[PDB]
Ligand binder design. Structure first.
Ligand SMILES: [Mg+2]
Ligand SMILES: [Mg+2]
Ligand SMILES: [Mg+2]
Ligand SMILES: [Mg+2]
Ligand SMILES: [Mg+2]
Ligand SMILES: [Mg+2]
Ligand SMILES: [Mg+2]
Ligand SMILES: [Mg+2]
Ligand SMILES: [Mg+2]
Ligand SMILES: [Mg+2]
Ligand SMILES: [Mg+2]
Ligand SMILES: [Mg+2]
Ligand SMILES: [Mg+2]
Ligand SMILES: [Mg+2]
Ligand SMILES: [Mg+2]
Ligand SMILES: [Mg+2]
Ligand SMILES: [Mg+2]
Ligand SMILES: [Mg+2]
Ligand SMILES: [Mg+2]
Ligand SMILES: [Mg+2]
Ligand SMILES: [Mg+2]
Ligand SMILES: [Mg+2]
Ligand SMILES: [Mg+2]
Ligand SMILES: [Mg+2]
Ligand SMILES: [Zn+2]
Lengths: 95, 30, 111, 36, 47, 56, 142
RNA sequence: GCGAAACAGUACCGUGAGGGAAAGGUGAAAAGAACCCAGAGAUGGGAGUGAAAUAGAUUCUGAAACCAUAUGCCUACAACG
RNA sequence: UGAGUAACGCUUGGGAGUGAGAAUCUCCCAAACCGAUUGACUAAGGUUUCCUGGACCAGGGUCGUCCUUCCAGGGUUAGUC
């Protein structure tokens, strides 16, 4: 509802491999506390096309910048894979 | 031609060389 | 108020440059410095770096810029007086506009 | 060319130095050389 | 050979965890002292 | 067995007196001129008058 | 007129490097290069680079003839070490000291270069004695 | 001097309670060495800035033990706190 | 100092290539061991050690152009497990 559970879309080789061939699959990063239903609701209120299904990924924090004078940890990411129906392809940028 | 020249190296954030997008190479490195 | 502002004429009273006239372009209050144009010209040995659209050329040779100067070495320059001289300033408050204005103490010149 | 480093942190000779805890938890036992 | 320490998530958390320490007067005394020493790793719960 | 007395810095060098190195015998190639250690193929693969290996 | 070249933190040991440096001190340029290029030692393809750099900056920077260079002094001073813990048996441990050498090679064109060094030292000793003597008349003057 | 002048109750040790360090100083100002030479490069030698570069980032001063070089003298029938 | 001494902790030959540099890196051909296992799937534990590209300060008991090391980017999809 508040639509703070859609932080940033991410574009990688896996993402672009999916974003072709009839059904498109768009991968965003979402609030780690959000649920699948909240992700679908956010997509409903801000895009307008009902996802066919939603898959979720949790990327665990790991050590980064190892050996550097001050080492630091990573940030917890939850990934969401929206899949729109046949024949529909909306743009992530431009509204 | 020009798009062939602009696909060599110049690796984008999430990618490597070779499979550079055929149409999207003017956004990050503009 | 402040002794030195951005814009007023200033000279140097100590160092190699004596009677060094310039215009203050910018004031760092925290480090008590002041960049004055034409004085303390240093020439950094400009390397070559190419990692950006602008860095592809980044033509830099013997660029001479401005080094900051301690605010203590600076002294305000008089202009209204027929015989220009170096002096100290006050912080009188004129009731005409109720705004603080600097006035020299060896004369009666504002700012 | 194109040899540059515009990042705020960049170095090839990474600073590191190994330390020693002087772990010497050594002991010993008895013997067959006992003259009683 | 079988050394003394055989790791296990469940056993470690149930013996030296925060909830295990916050169940008796002795554990409360230990945590206050560890807070006095300003230990970054208060218990084994935090990595 | 372990030293009950320390060996000075002079006895050490007296023992090391026989550790000096020897200069290996060198000769001149008859087709390129560089010095090569004796009885061995030069850098050009030219031993005497015989083309041995392809040029470096 | 001594030209020189240096190398800090050379991986070779000074002990295992002095054996090679003693094979080139006092030797002519071409013969030293020829001798050092065919010696089967680790500290031979590193002293060669230092020697070559020294020749280059002697005939380019300081402007010397190039047909008069002889190895004046090639030495391997003791460099900083690094301490590591080698795990021994029965729980003990020892300290392995990877030792490093600071290499410096020096060549001259004049075969009498030691005389000038003794001369400067002689000049230095004399300046100390002259000051004492100059101080003594002044002490007597007052 | 508080264990801790630096990001110290940290790194690290132990299952745990607990135990527990070392490490400061370029230059007035980075003006941190463009350029040339050797090298694959780091780097070194010049050039340049600077009063000083043997103040060069290994950055106030730099002791001894220790390791090398050299002028001069002595030493291969010699029992040596 | 011991001392450049002991030790370097079970596995061969060649051809081609990269590279400034190759017994140690890549490919190929053999060769030798495992084969109720050095084969394959997982629990526990480990916690990115997984993939790509680059590097050879440090570590690899030698070497290294190479690494489970370092840098940058990426990788883990459940109504039925
Ligand atoms: Mg899931
Ligand atoms: Mg000696
Ligand atoms: Mg010997
Ligand atoms: Mg053991
Ligand atoms: Mg210098
Ligand atoms: Mg010093
Ligand atoms: Mg005699
Ligand atoms: Mg006799
Ligand atoms: Mg007697
Ligand atoms: Mg006697
Ligand atoms: Mg000892
Ligand atoms: Mg020794
Ligand atoms: Mg022995
Ligand atoms: Mg032996
Ligand atoms: Mg042996
Ligand atoms: Mg082995
Ligand atoms: Mg073998
Ligand atoms: Mg068999
Ligand atoms: Mg197996
Ligand atoms: Mg790691
Ligand atoms: Mg890999
Ligand atoms: Mg690689
Ligand atoms: Mg090695
Ligand atoms: Mg299904
Ligand atoms: Zn030849």
């Amino acid at each position: 509802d508040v639509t703070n559970v859609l932080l940033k879309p991410v574009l990688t080789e896996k993402v672009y491999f999916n974003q072709m061939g009839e059904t498109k699959k768009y991968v965003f990063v979402v609030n780690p506390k959000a649920s699948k239903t909240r992700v679908k609701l956010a997509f409903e209120l801000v895009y307008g096309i009902k996802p066919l299904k939603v898959n979720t990924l949790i990327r665990k924090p790991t050590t980064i910048r190892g050996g550097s004078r001050f080492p630091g940890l990573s940030k917890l990411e939850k990934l969401a894979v929206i899949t729109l129906p046949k024949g529909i392809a909306i743009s992530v940028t431009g509204e | 031609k020009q798009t062939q020249d602009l696909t060599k190296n110049m690796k984008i954030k999430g990618f490597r060389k070779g499979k550079v997008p055929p149409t999207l190479a003017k956004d990050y490195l503009d | 108020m402040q002794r030195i502002k951005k814009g007023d004429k200033v000279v140097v009273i100590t160092g190699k440059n004596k009677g060094g006239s310039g215009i203050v372009l910018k004031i760092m209050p925290a480090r008590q410095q002041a960049i004055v144009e034409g004085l303390n010209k240093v020439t950094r040995h400009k390397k070559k770096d190419q990692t950006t659209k602008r860095a592809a050329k980044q033509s830099t040779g013997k660029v001479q810029q401005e080094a900051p100067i301690f605010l203590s070495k600076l002294a305000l320059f008089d202009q209204k007086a027929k015989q220009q001289t170096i002096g100290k300033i006050k912080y009188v408050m004129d009731p005409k506009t109720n705004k603080k204005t600097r006035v020299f103490k060896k004369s009666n010149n504002t700012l | 060319x194109x040899x540059x480093x515009x990042x705020x942190x960049x170095x090839x000779x990474x600073x590191x130095x190994x330390x020693x805890x002087x772990x010497x938890x050594x002991x010993x036992x008895x013997x067959x050389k006992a003259a009683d | 050979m079988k050394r003394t320490y055989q790791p296990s998530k469940l056993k470690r958390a149930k013996t030296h965890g925060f909830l295990a320490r916050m169940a008796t007067a002795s554990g409360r005394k230990v945590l206050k002292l560890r807070r006095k020493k300003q230990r970054a790793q208060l218990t084994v719960s935090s990595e | 067995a372990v030293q009950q007395r320390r060996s000075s810095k002079h006895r050490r060098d007296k023992r090391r007196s026989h550790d000096a190195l020897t200069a290996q015998a060198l000769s001149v190639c008859q087709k390129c001129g560089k010095k090569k250690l004796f009885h061995r193929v030069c850098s050009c693969g030219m031993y005497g008058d015989l083309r041995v290996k392809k040029a470096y | 007129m001594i030209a020189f070249a240096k190398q800090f933190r050379v991986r070779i040991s000074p002990q295992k490097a002095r054996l090679v440096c003693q094979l080139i001190v006092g030797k002519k340029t071409a013969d030293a290069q020829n001798i050092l290029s065919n010696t089967p030692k680790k500290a031979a393809t590193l002293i060669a680079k230092l020697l070559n750099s020294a020749i280059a900056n002697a005939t380019n920077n300081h402007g010397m003839n190039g047909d008069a260079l002889y190895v004046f002094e090639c030495v391997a001073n003791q460099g900083p070490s690094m301490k590591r813990t080698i795990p021994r048996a029965k729980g003990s441990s020892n300290m392995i000291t990877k030792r490093s050498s600071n290499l410096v090679v020096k060549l001259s064109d004049n075969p009498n270069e030691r005389q000038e060094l003794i001369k400067q030292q002689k000049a230095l000793v004399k300046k100390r004695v002259e000051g004492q003597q100059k101080a003594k008349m002044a002490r007597q003057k007052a």
